[PDB]
Amino acid sequence: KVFGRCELAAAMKRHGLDNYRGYSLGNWVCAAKFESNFNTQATNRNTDGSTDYGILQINSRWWCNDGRTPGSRNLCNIPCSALLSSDITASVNCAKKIVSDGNGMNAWVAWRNRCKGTDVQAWIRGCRL
Ligand code: NA
Numbered sequence: 001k002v003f004g005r006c007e008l009a010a011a012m013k014r015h016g017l018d019n020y021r022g023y024s025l026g027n028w029v030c031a032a033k034f035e036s037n038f039n040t041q042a043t044n045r046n047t048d049g050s051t052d053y054g055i056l057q058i059n060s061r062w063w064c065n066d067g068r069t070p071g072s073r074n075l076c077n078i079p080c081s082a083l084l085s086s087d088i089t090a091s092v093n094c095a096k097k098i099v100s101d102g103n104g105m106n107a108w109v110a111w112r113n114r115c116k117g118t119d120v121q122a123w124i125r126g127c128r129l
Contacts, residue, residue, distance in 0.1 A: 001086040003038040005029060006127035008055070008088075013129055015092040021099045025129070026120030027111065028095075032056060033123065034110040040091075041084050054083035054091045056098075056108070063094055 003011065009029050012018065018025035035057035036042035044052045050061035050069045060069040064080035076094035083091050098107050105111045 001040045003032075003040070003055070005033070005038065005123065006129075008032055008038050009124045009127045009129055011088050012092065015089060017092055017095065018129075020096060021104060023099065023105055024120060026123040027105060027115060029123035030115035030118070030120045031105060031108045031111040034114045035108060040086055040088065043084070051080065053080040054085075055088055056083075056091050056095050057110075058083050058091065058094050058098065063098060 009025055012028045013025055017028045032038055032055050036055045038055065040055050042054060042057065044057060046052060046059065046061070048061060050059050050072060051066055052059050053064060058064055058076070060066040060080050061072050063074070063076045064078050064083055065074040066080040076097055078090055078094065083094065099105055101107060105116070
């Protein structure tokens, strides 16, 4: 599923991401835009042989199992395929563990490089939330 910007903002808010670990909703929407362009089916191979999955490009190196990332972990206890669903519950549940790991949203390099310090409220502008 390719979410609309406000559609994704609504979904993230409902699942309690808005201000989770102090990160306002626009930060999450901004991270999703540059990770996945709001596409739940997005997959990208990393240099290390891990893969990133779904709207928030969650990495098989630590967070989900994909059966092809040797020496990796599954800290969200889910198949990586579950992070490609049209229903973002599993991605949000796992993203809450990631952002709690100690470096906040710096875990998402695209957030640090493209969202951090910027006018992230623009991403929820005009949304009926
Ligand atoms: Na893994």
